[PDB]
Design a protein around this ligand. Structure first.
Ligand SMILES: CC(C)CCC[C@@H](C)[C@H]1CC[C@H]2[C@@H]3CC=C4C[C@@H](O)CC[C@]4(C)[C@H]3CC[C@]12C
Ligand SMILES: CC(C)CCC[C@@H](C)[C@H]1CC[C@H]2[C@@H]3CC=C4C[C@@H](O)CC[C@]4(C)[C@H]3CC[C@]12C
Ligand SMILES: CC(C)CCC[C@@H](C)[C@H]1CC[C@H]2[C@@H]3CC=C4C[C@@H](O)CC[C@]4(C)[C@H]3CC[C@]12C
Ligand SMILES: CC(C)CCC[C@@H](C)[C@H]1CC[C@H]2[C@@H]3CC=C4C[C@@H](O)CC[C@]4(C)[C@H]3CC[C@]12C
Ligand SMILES: CC(C)CCC[C@@H](C)[C@H]1CC[C@H]2[C@@H]3CC=C4C[C@@H](O)CC[C@]4(C)[C@H]3CC[C@]12C
Ligand SMILES: NCCc1c[nH]cn1
Lengths: 272, 231, 57, 342, 229
């Protein structure tokens, strides 16, 4: 019971922060830049996690058996998998946009049209919705109990390894390489003008450590469960997914809050 | 100069298909909405179809909906009317009409010469079919509508057209009071609610013709029977 | 001789401005106050009209 | 010798004018209007927001029907708005994007604009082709075009940064009259209601009253300490108000030939960009650099209200001919329509 | 809304669609303000790289739009508000003319400390270096006559003179540059930077120097919004 109170606050904070970010872009015209489109997409996925995925997960802890029925269990898995994957890909496309705008600032200006950014956002969400097919069509294409709401393909080893690499491992390696290149340019940019580089290291560290630490235990456990088929524990499994949900709460505190225009806009609306 | 030339009309068999073209020159074609209006022999005007500027909005009359397709080619400045399953009821002269819509604009200001096709709802009433007139004397023409043409924005969407014998209709009065460009000041439009009057002071020989009142409050656009002036 | 030519024009202009008839400030102030008073009722910004008569509802 | 003697005579004439103005300064406008009741608090709401400009708006002008307005922005776009519906009636692409002024003809058939290109371009709004086209480009100014106002469909007055104003014959494209006498860049002009006189404010901190037909300067008004940016005739044509960079607005009288009232506040330290009067002239509305528009009591020099709806400089404002609403343009790329409610 | 009002509202939305397309083209193009005196030779740099004179030169498929507000006089405090959002200001001076250098220093100080130019970087060009080299080589006129501090000025060790350049030429050339940079470092608080360069009347690398300087201006803009700087 006391745990539910703590988790309920996290759910409310996630919805409140992401709703505030979404409306601030609408009201303020200085926030209509191309780079803020990716931030909007990132907050949408986290809002879906807070609005849909989190409350159902909290009820799952109150009552161990899934009391919402079979058809609603599949819907929760689809919302959990699509929104989390979209959040991961929203961070990835935002890292690409920042990488290209730093390596080739003048050349990338022509290709930064909102039309091309929106296509990138749609492409990230289109791949996110592809998680629905394995969740629902696993029986048609390729150990289940009514109490639990596990996915059908949870025991499969080859599929989980293939999906984990595409979902998390491959984007994380590129994000590490892209932000490494960005840090190379930021350090060079500061040295050309004049330890001021700690500003970028602190920001790049916060961006990357929060994304990795909140998601590495889940995706490590994502493939370990299939390897042994009995090493998995439900208490540990719920711990890993909640760390993934925390990343949704931290996203408004990382990308929008660190921006000056968002910070000014947030202070105006809250104080009315 | 502003020109609208229609082509493709002619005698067709019942149940056949025909493609009408309207080539526009001398004005920004892509900026104007376009209407097709037909006139059966020895009958009044009947609105057929409408395509807006930018091709976003298309309207058809019920008697032709599903059989006629209206389209435009902005780069070529050509207006099209694809007709299918043609009936004997479709025998008429088809006019190409330009109409631009913004605050203070004058829709239906220019009409084409028309092409003849021969096949082998607010009610606007013009009870007076013909009026004997003499030059230099003032004439009044009355029009009635089943519904009030006064909108809540203050406009009264009533139009007056003059079709001289052998010529295409010309706009005289738009929105019940405004005088169309190139029209002598002797024409004056007065109305209220459902009753409207077109006053022609000091009638001349050129004013002889058939006068039509059209409503533009809502689609389908409907015409009055028409009042003929004779000497 | 550019400065001397400009000096004559500036002096000649000041003669025209110095020969005008000036009314008292009290007379001018009363006229401004009178005009504001006479047209006060027909000023929508000063006295807002009822919402039915406002085109910008 | 002769030059020294002449410039001494100018000082004597200046003292004669200063003594003449002091002689007729028997009372103050503040003393005269002390007894009358204040206008109270003026509360205006944003009825409309006109969106579509993608850069700083530099000028706007209402049409005489109190419904259509034209705005100029440095995105190279002249836009004509239907203020009742916020519909865009026209969008005129400008050849030069550095526009500084725009004017709506009283007939409604033409609009004019011009800026750093030193050209006043006339655009025909009523063409048989259905599009707006350039009808005339008025060349002849050797500085930027700061303001322009139609007298009719054939005459327009322009003020320039080359220290001169000109009256133009649009049909022939030639300036019939040139108004010289300002020693700085003329930043604004206002037409008298009968269009027989106009006042202009320059960067020499002086306002000159010009006769349109005669073509000479009738009176010169001084008192500002910095460049004058805005000027507006009183509705009866017997007075005008100016706005300068010294954070003050002054009301000058034509017949008394002197300043009558100053509109300044201790908090206000920013320049003034635009000034206008309400239909009765009781309200003086001024746009400021501090993102706000202050409504002043013209008679009592009291700040009646504040229009706070912009996030950047208020670059221009105007009041409709019927007095129903006031439009404010701003560097934040938005136009807003304001009026009160009962 | 009536039938004609719906048609009018559709026309308005087609106007908005064309306004958005025009605003996308303006974002890809970099705007530059070309300032300088009559003797600066700013008309030579634009011609080689090629009311209001507008020039469009493209470097590496990047479009630069440069403006020169010719005419009028030194009273430019009014129209300078128009260029409140240009990417850079290209200020050109004449280093050979020692007599008018103080006017250029005073002119540069007004631009740098202008109220409406607090966030605009300056791409400073010190033009006519070939003429300056000949003037120093001749030795008829001395810079120390106009600037007393030049007698006590020593070339910094960090200086990297080009090969084949006389040390006297380098000492005078770097003294003129430091005078302008000293003005830039006085204020600004890092909002805008100055990018001094030495050019000649026959130099063909001016377009790329602006390109490399505008890249740093845009890069600094991107890093600030990412909170990386
Ligand atoms: C309530 C949750 C679970 C359902 C998802 C809500 C979605 C469909 C709604 C809620 C918030 C909305 C967003 C609010 C803000 C913006 C920014 C604007 O520039 C584009 C539209 C956009 C992006 C909206 C898209 C649709 C949106 C994301
Ligand atoms: C599904 C798996 C197998 C493929 C994943 C596609 C990823 C790895 C590919 C597809 C599109 C690629 C991007 C396309 C364009 C650019 C811009 C360039 O300046 C840097 C590389 C970068 C950013 C690429 C990074 C890698 C990338 C994102
Ligand atoms: C489960 C459902 C609710 C998830 C919905 C996700 C999709 C439909 C939503 C979420 C984020 C939204 C995008 C957010 C931002 C933009 C940029 C805008 O300029 C075009 C629309 C566009 C591209 C939106 C398209 C629709 C969108 C992709
Ligand atoms: C990490 C892997 C698995 C997923 C990465 C998703 C993103 C980075 C990839 C997947 C689909 C790709 C998009 C596919 C289609 C288009 C439309 C084209 O006109 C511009 C490139 C663009 C916009 C691509 C941008 C990058 C993109 C959005
Ligand atoms: C903002 C701060 C409070 C965030 C703190 C995050 C950590 C300390 C909290 C947030 C979510 C919590 C977890 C929520 C769910 C479970 C599953 C349960 O069977 C064991 C406890 C456990 C594993 C909790 C452990 C502590 C926990 C991980
Ligand atoms: N809770 C995270 C579910 C997920 C998303 N992608 C893969 N698995």
């Amino acid at each position: 019971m006391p745990l539910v109170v703590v988790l309920s606050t996290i759910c409310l904070v996630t919805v409140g922060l992401n709703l505030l970010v979404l409306y601030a872009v609408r009201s303020e015209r200085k926030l209509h830049t191309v780079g803020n489109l990716y931030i909007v997409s990132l907050s949408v996925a986290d809002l879906i996690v807070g609005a849909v995925v989190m409350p159902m997960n909290i009820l799952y802890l109150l009552m161990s058996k899934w009391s919402l029925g079979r058809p609603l269990c599949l819907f929760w898995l689809s919302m959990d998998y699509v929104a989390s994957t979209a959040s991961i890909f929203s961070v990835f496309i935002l890292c690409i946009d920042r990488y290209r705008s730093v390596q080739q600032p003048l050349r990338y200006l022509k290709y930064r049209t909102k039309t091309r950014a929106s296509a990138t956002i749609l492409g990230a969400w289109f791949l996110s919705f592809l998680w629905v097919i394995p969740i629902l069509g696993w029986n048609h294409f390729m150990v289940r109990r009514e109490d639990k709401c596990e996915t059908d393909f949870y025991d499969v080893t080859w599929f989980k390894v293939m999906t984990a690499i595409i979902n998390f491992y491959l984007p994380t390696l590129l994000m590490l390489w892209f932000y490494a290149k960005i840090y190379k340019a930021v350090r060079q940019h500061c040295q050309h003008r004049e330890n001021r580089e700690r500003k970028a290291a602190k920001q790049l560290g916060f961006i990357m450590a929060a994304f990795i630490l909140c998601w590495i235990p889940y995706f490590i456990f994502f493939m370990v469960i299939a390897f042994c088929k009995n090493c998995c524990n439900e208490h540990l499994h719920m711990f890993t997914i909640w760390l993934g949900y925390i990343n949704s709460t931290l996203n408004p505190l990382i990308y929008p809050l660190c921006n000056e225009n968002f910070k000014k806009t947030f202070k105006r609306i809250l104080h009315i | 100069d502003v020109q609208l030339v229609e082509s493709g009309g002619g005698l067709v068999q019942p149940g056949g298909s025909r493609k009408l073209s309207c080539s526009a020159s001398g004005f920004a074609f892509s900026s104007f909405g376009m209407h097709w209006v037909r006139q059966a022999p020895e009958k009044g005007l009947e609105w057929v179809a409408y395509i807006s500027s930018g091709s976003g909005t298309i309207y058809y009359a019920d008697t032709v909906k599903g059989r006629f397709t209206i389209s435009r080619d902005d780069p070529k400045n050509t207006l099209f009317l694809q007709m299918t399953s043609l009936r004997s009821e479709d025998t008429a002269m088809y006019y190409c009409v330009r109409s631009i819509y913004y605050y203070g604009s004058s829709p239906f200001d220019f009409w084409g010469q028309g092409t003849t096709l021969t096949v082998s709802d607010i009610v606007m009433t013009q009870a007076t079919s013909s009026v004997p007139v003499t030059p230099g004397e003032s004439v009044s023409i009355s029009c009635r509508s089943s519904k009030s043409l006064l909108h809540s924005n203050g406009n009264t969407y009533l139009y007056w057209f003059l079709q001289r014998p052998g010529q295409s209709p010309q706009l005289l009065i738009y929105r019940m009071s405004n005088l169309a460009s190139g029209v002598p000041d002797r024409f004056s439009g007065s109305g209220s609610g459902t009753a409207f009057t077109l006053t022609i002071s000091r009638l001349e020989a050129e004013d002889v013709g058939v006068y039509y009142c059209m409503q533009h409050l809502e689609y389908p656009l409907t015409f009055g029977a028409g009042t003929k002036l004779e000497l | 001789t550019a400065s001397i030519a400009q000096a004559r024009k500036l002096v000649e202009q000041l003669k025209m401005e110095a020969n005008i008839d000036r009314i008292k400030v009290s007379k001018a102030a009363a006229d401004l106050m009178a005009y504001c008073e006479a047209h006060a009722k027909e000023d929508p910004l000063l006295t807002p009209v009822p919402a039915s008569e406002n085109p910008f509802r | 010798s002769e030059l020294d003697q002449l410039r001494q005579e100018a000082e004597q004439l200046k003292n004669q004018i200063r003594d003449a103005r002091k002689a007729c300064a028997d009372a103050t406008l503040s003393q005269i209007t002390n007894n009358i009741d204040p206008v109270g608090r003026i509360q205006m709401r944003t009825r409309r927001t006109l969106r579509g400009h993608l850069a700083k708006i530099y000028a706007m002008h209402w049409g005489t029907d109190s419904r259509l307005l034209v705005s100029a922005s440095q995105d190279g776009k002249l836009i004509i708005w239907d203020s009742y519906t916020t519909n865009k009636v026209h969008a005129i692409p400008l050849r030069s994007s550095w526009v500084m002024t725009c004017a709506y003809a009283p007939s409604g058939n033409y609009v004019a604009c011009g800026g750093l290109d030193n050209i006043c371009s006339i655009y025909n709004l009523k063409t048989r082709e259905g599009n707006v086209r350039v009808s005339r480009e008025l060349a002849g100014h050797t500085g930027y075009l700061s303001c322009c106002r139609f007298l009719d469909d054939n005459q327009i007055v322009t003020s320039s940064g080359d220290t001169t104003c000109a009256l133009w014959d649009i049909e022939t494209g030639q300036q019939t009259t040139t108004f010289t006498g300002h020693t700085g860049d003329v930043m604004s002009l206002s037409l008298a209601p009968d269009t027989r006189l106009f006042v202009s404010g320059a960067c020499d901190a002086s306002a000159k009253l010009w006769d349109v037909r005669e073509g000479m300067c009738r009176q010169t008004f001084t008192g500002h300490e910095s460049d004058i940016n805005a000027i507006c005739f009183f509705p009866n044509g017997n007075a005008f108000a100016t706005g300068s960079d010294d954070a003050t607005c002054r009301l000058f009288d034509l017949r008394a030939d002197q300043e009558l009232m100053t509109y300044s506040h201790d908090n206000i330290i920013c320049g003034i960009t635009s000034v206008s009067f309400s239909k009765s002239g009781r309200l003086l509305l001024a746009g400021y650099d501090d993102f706000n528009c202050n409504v002043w009591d013209a008679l009592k020099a009291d700040r009646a209200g504040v229009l706070a709806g912009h996030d950047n400089r208020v670059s221009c404002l105007g009041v409709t001919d019927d007095g129903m609403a006031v439009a404010t343009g701003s560097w934040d790329s938005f136009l807003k329509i304001w009026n009160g409610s009962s | 809304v009536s039938a004609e009002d719906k048609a009018a509202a559709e026309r308005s939305k087609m106007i908005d669609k064309n306004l958005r397309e025009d605003g996308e083209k303006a974002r890809r193009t970099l705007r530059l303000l070309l300032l300088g005196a009559d003797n600066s030779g700013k008309s030579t740099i634009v011609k080689q790289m090629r009311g209001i004179f507008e020039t469009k030169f493209q470097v590496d498929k990047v479009n630069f739009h440069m403006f020169d507000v010719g005419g009028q006089r030194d009273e430019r405090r009014k129209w300078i508000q128009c260029f409140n959002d240009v990417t850079a200001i290209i200020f050109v001076v004449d280093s050979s003319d020692y007599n008018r250098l103080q006017e250029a220093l005073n002119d540069f100080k007004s631009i740098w400390n202008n109220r409406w130019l607090r966030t605009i970087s300056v791409i400073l060009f010190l033009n006519k270096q070939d003429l300056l080299a000949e003037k120093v080589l001749a030795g008829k006129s001395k810079i120390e006559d106009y600037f007393p501090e030049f007698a006590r000025y020593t070339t910094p060790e960090d200086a990297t003179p080009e090969p084949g350049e006389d040390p006297r030429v380098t000492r005078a050339k770097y003294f003129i540059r430091k005078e302008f940079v000293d003005i830039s470092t006085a204020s600004g608080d890092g909002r805008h930077i100055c990018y001094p360069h030495f050019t000649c009347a026959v130099d063909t690398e001016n377009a790329r120097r602006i390109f490399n300087d505008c890249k740093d201006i845009i890069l600094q803009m991107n890093l600030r919004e990412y909170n990386l700087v």
